[PDB]
């Protein structure tokens, strides 16, 4: 009866929504990790730029 099909459809929608929220959570986590390692790379680059400034000032 229509109620049975209704239960089936609601279960379908529930599965799809769960998948969508999994995708969103992955997006958030990936963004956080990328921020962290970008900060690290930037710091490393900054440490290197200052060092080359100092060296080339010492050699001239």
């Amino acid at each position: 009866r229509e109620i049975h099909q209704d239960w089936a459809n609601r279960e379908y929608i529930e599965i799809i929504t769960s998948s969508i929220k999994k995708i969103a959570d992955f997006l958030n986590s990936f963004d956080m990790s990328c921020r962290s390692r970008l900060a690290t790379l930037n710091e490393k680059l900054t440490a290197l730029e200052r060092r080359i400034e100092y060296i080339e000032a010492r050699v001239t």
Partner: protein, 85 residues
Amino acid sequence: NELECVTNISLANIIRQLSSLSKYAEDIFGELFNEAHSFSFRVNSLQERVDRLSVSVTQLDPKEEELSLQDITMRKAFRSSTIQD
């Protein structure tokens, strides 16, 4: 009200949510890519400078090196960057 109408409306709603998610994901990825591109520019500039400095350093002459005793202080001192956000 027939239930199938509600289910179809909900399916359209989840597709709209998918589109919104696509836009938000694009926003995040662009925010990452812009600063990554900036890092790439900085790395290329530093690589050029390092190549120049290496070829310059390989030809330093110690025996010809001469130091001016008289000019020890009238020379301008080296100062490191002091940028503070």
